[PDB]
Design an enzyme around this catalytic site. Structure first.
Site, mmCIF file in Angstrom:
data_model
loop_
_atom_site.group_PDB
_atom_site.id
_atom_site.type_symbol
_atom_site.label_atom_id
_atom_site.label_comp_id
_atom_site.label_asym_id
_atom_site.label_seq_id
_atom_site.Cartn_x
_atom_site.Cartn_y
_atom_site.Cartn_z
ATOM 1 N N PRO B 1 -2.798 7.599 94.337
ATOM 2 C CA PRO B 1 -1.477 7.307 93.764
ATOM 3 C C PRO B 1 -1.421 5.919 93.139
ATOM 4 C CG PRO B 1 -1.312 8.170 96.008
ATOM 5 C CD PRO B 1 -2.727 7.736 95.799
ATOM 6 N N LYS B 32 -0.981 9.224 102.077
ATOM 7 C CA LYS B 32 -2.340 8.840 101.721
ATOM 8 C C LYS B 32 -2.651 7.461 102.281
ATOM 9 C CE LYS B 32 -1.817 11.942 97.991
ATOM 10 N NZ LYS B 32 -2.651 12.729 97.045
ATOM 11 N N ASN B 97 8.826 8.078 85.471
ATOM 12 C CA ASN B 97 8.104 9.252 84.998
ATOM 13 C C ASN B 97 7.047 9.654 86.023
ATOM 14 O OD1 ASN B 97 9.267 9.873 82.391
ATOM 15 N ND2 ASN B 97 8.359 7.958 81.629
#
Ligand SMILES: *[C@@H](c1ccccn1)c1ccc2cccnc2c1O
Ligand SMILES: *[C@@H](c1ccccn1)c1ccc2cccnc2c1O
Ligand SMILES: *[C@@H](c1ccccn1)c1ccc2cccnc2c1O
EC number: 5.3.2.1
Lengths: 117, 118, 114
Positions: B1, B32, B97
């Site tokens: 990420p 994670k 986004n």
């Protein structure tokens, strides 16, 4: 094709020749004329990787085609190699997002690359 | 990420341990380990939101999986919360986004995360 | 809609009114109210286009819908026009990436547009 690199490496540490080496190596890698290739380097960034502020980079490569499994692994080897040699950034502190752009979704010269319909 | 924030908030207004806080919060949120998480904050930007240059932010979160309707709403509450509390940016002047990246399209450590086929 | 322009043109060369003109023209072009429109201009960038560092720009437009073949050609004419007139960048040294975003993948005000 266009390649962007954002990094916390200081501007002074970016060597003379870097943008031109990226341009030429990417032309070779993509098999596309250098006239098409855009490169963008953004140093001195406030970023962390794995919570550490050691040198790192977040990158993107956009291309209309020539994006995919083996090709992307080849781009990664090439680009991580350049970032390591030139900016002294460890390859395991680099992310590169690859985008296979549709020709209709890339603008250039007052239009796009979708000229067919 | 990886999470990127671009904002017109001044560099001086960015808290010292802000990157670490984002890393920890994103690790928890994504499930994670922090060793994978990348964060990037870009202050002092020339931006407008709704025609106004009051504090705002344009952000992105890229993740391989763990992207979707319910999850993204959760990410937005978390990330808007942090931006509001730490950078004093109103949530209705933030866009984020979200990108669900394919493992083959994310490069790292001389290769990608597509290691299964040739 | 949100538009980002990264360019090697100096900050001093960005005219007063530029963000507001972009906001207004993008509102008109996308049909969306100006209250939605976000614009972001990043001058003084280290870039090359075709191996040359003459003025150039790398841009993006994200929109929930209103992205497509003819629409994008129209956005490109509009945006290249503005970059040429206001920042003196040749249209053939501009790239614009268009993204049609799913409403569920756009966060805003503690939630998404889905
Ligand atoms: C590379 C590229 C891809 C996406 C966004 C910006 N640049 C690129 C540039 C120009 C052409 C022209 C014709 C065919 N393909 C490309 C291309 O992949
Ligand atoms: C997060 C991520 C996604 C896209 C681009 C950059 N970072 C991330 C990083 C590494 C792994 C490894 C294995 C599985 N998933 C991820 C991941 O989501
Ligand atoms: C423009 C936009 C699209 C993607 C990311 C950021 N901004 C935009 C903003 C808000 C709405 C709300 C409802 C429907 N459409 C939009 C939209 O296109």
């Amino acid at each position: 094709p266009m390649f962007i690199v954002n990094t916390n490496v200081p501007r002074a540490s970016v060597p003379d020749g870097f943008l031109s080496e990226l341009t030429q190596q990417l032309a070779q890698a993509t098999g596309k004329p250098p006239q098409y290739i855009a490169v963008h380097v953004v140093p001195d960034q406030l970023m962390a990787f794995g919570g550490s502020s050691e040198p790192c980079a977040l990158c993107s490569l956009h291309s209309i085609g020539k994006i995919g499994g083996a090709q992307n692994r080849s781009y990664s080897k090439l680009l991580c190699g350049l970032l390591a040699e030139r900016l002294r950034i460890s390859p395991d502190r680099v992310y590169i997002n690859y985008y296979d752009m549709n020709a209709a979704n890339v603008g250039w010269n007052n239009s796009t690359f979708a000229l067919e319909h």
